[PDB]
Amino acid sequence: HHHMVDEILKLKKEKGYIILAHNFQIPELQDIADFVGDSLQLARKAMELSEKKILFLGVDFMAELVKILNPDKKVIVPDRSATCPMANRLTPEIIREYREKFPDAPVVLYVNSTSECKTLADVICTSANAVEVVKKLDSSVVIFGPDRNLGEYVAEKTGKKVITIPENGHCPVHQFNAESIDAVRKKYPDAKVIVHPECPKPVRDKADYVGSTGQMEKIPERDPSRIFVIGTEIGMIHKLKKKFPDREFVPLEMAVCVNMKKNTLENTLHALQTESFEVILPKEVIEKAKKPILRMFELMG
Ligand SMILES: O=C(O)c1ccc(S)nc1C(=O)O
Ligand code: SF4
Numbered sequence: 001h002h003h004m005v006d007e008i009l010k011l012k013k014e015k016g017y018i019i020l021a022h023n024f025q026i027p028e029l030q031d032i033a034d035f036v037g038d039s040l041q042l043a044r045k046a047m048e049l050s051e052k053k054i055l056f057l058g059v060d061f062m063a064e065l066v067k068i069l070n071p072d073k074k075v076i077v078p079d080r081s082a083t084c085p086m087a088n089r090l091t092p093e094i095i096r097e098y099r100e101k102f103p104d105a106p107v108v109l110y111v112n113s114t115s116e117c118k119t120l121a122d123v124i125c126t127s128a129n130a131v132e133v134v135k136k137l138d139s140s141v142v143i144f145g146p147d148r149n150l151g152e153y154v155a156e157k158t159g160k161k162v163i164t165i166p167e168n169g170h171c172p173v174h175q176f177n178a179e180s181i182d183a184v185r186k187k188y189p190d191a192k193v194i195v196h197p198e199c200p201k202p203v204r205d206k207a208d209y210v211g212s213t214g215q216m217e218k219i220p221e222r223d224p225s226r227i228f229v230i231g232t233e234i235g236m237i238h239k240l241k242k243k244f245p246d247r248e249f250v251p252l253e254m255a256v257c258v259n260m261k262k263n264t265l266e267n268t269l270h271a272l273q274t275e276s277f278e279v280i281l282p283k284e285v286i287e288k289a290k291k292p293i294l295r296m297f298e299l300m301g
């Protein structure tokens, strides 16, 4: 690890790579990254860079997001199989089926979606902006995927009708038990519970705050509470504890995204040695997927 970390830092400098790491990476990889953040934060950061080579540490749809918004940069990932099972359950066939049945409902796709699915979306959204995006659409009905929990949250906050696809679209990592909140309230009476909107409704409704990872790291800037209980993937505990060393961050439960943990010091070192595996999308996919991303930027403009 001493070897691997030094060799990584050496090869990144030597070959002109910037390392971008998602919040759900292992701490060792967060610590060697130039920037750690959420998928949109990392894509927007990449647009600002003078460097034309990126080593991306996350899962495929996010690396592809970076590539869509930075087509002329070389983007490589250490494990080409790192993917989002939830994203992968939504298909072009299901989107087209639902557009045909509800032709007046805009297709709002969570950024946790395949690039192919993005080519068919009317607008992209993040967990932070989903409510605001859906509020600003003309329609009082939207098609939303692939996360049924976030879709239902959006319906609650907007009062709009949200038709969720696919059937039972969810993120296994965020299926905490509401009983975990009951238990931490007893154990740390003054702790603030922050959970993800991908969490099920009973968990959301028992939390002090519901928010994206990006929103979670901003809450201690306005809430002086000593202890925060965190209902997301375990990588966020490391991120939060680094940003706010003066507070305590307690996992609601241990929750690990197996795909996020496919990236390691070893295979990150192999990626810089070989300059593989490059993220390549057909130009047509990039052009089409860009349209609902730009719409998102326009709506949040
Ligand atoms: O930031 C978020 O809340 C979030 C949660 C899960 C996953 S895979 N990604 C993200 C994100 O980068 O937006
Ligand atoms: S944490 Fe959930 S939403 Fe994020 S990549 Fe892993 S399975 Fe997909």
Ligand SMILES: [Cl-]
Pocket (backbone or CB within 6 Å): 069, 070, 071, 072, 073
């Ligand atoms: Cl570019």
